[PDB]
């Protein structure tokens, strides 16, 4: 099986350095030029650098030339990207890609590793209730607001997985503070607000924070 396993990513502070790895198996690593391609969250693709099969030729895109260094160890079937002087603009998923046709396009990709350039510190979320309104015979809406956590991600389920229909968990948004916030919401019958209990189960593994919050009519 052909695979490209990437590692070395994570949160890094602005101005600091970091090395990404990409390990190949299932094909002859040493006969292919290899590329790094990155994609910032919500954005498109951008080529970063290439290295020839025996490392003689190395090319970089404008925005990283002089800060990034690409290399490889064919005996280990490993590709590296040394990133220095990292900036907020370098936050992205970093893919390694094989140049199967030796033509500067990419026929096989790894699944990427995320690099987050931030000074924010690991912090677990506060989980607040979005209580259903008293003016809601038909359908009612309730949720929970998980505020001020870093880094991503958080997971949210309702009633320990028993409630999935009508559930909308929104993408996190990044606040000026440097912390993330997201909302999770579900629509339920108004007739079930006094009987059925609604628990949103939040899990933020980076801080080992697990919260079960009951959302009641006030």
């Amino acid at each position: 099986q052909m695979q490209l396993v990437e590692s070395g990513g994570g949160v890094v502070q602005p101005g600091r350095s970091l090395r990404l790895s990409c390990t190949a198996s299932g094909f002859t690593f040493s006969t292919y030029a290899m590329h790094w391609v990155r994609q910032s969250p919500g954005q498109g693709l951008q080529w970063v650098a290439v290295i020839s099969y025996h490392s003689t030729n190395k090319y970089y895109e404008d925005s990283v030339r002089g800060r990034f260094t690409i290399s490889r160890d064919n005996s280990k079937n490993t590709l590296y990207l040394q990133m220095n002087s990292l900036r907020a603009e370098d936050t992205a998923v970093y893919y390694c890609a094989r140049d199967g046709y030796s033509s500067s396009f990419f026929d096989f990709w790894g699944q990427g590793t995320l690099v987050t350039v931030s000074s924010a510190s690991t912090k677990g979320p506060s989980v607040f209730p979005l209580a259903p309104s008293s003016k809601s015979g038909g359908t009612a809406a309730l949720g929970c607001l998980v505020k001020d956590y870093f880094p991503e991600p958080v997971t949210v389920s309702w009633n320990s997985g028993a409630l999935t229909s009508g559930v909308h968990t929104f993408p996190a948004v990044l606040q000026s503070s440097g912390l993330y916030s997201l909302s999770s919401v579900v629509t339920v019958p108004s007739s079930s607000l006094g009987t059925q209990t609604y628990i949103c189960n939040v899990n933020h593994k980076p801080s080992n924070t697990k919260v079960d919050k009951k959302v009641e009519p006030k």
Partner: peptide, 12 residues
């Protein structure tokens, strides 16, 4: 192209 030998590419 696993069958291509980059050490024998005459275009290089």
């Amino acid at each position: 192209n696993p069958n291509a030998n980059p050490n024998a590419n005459p275009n290089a």
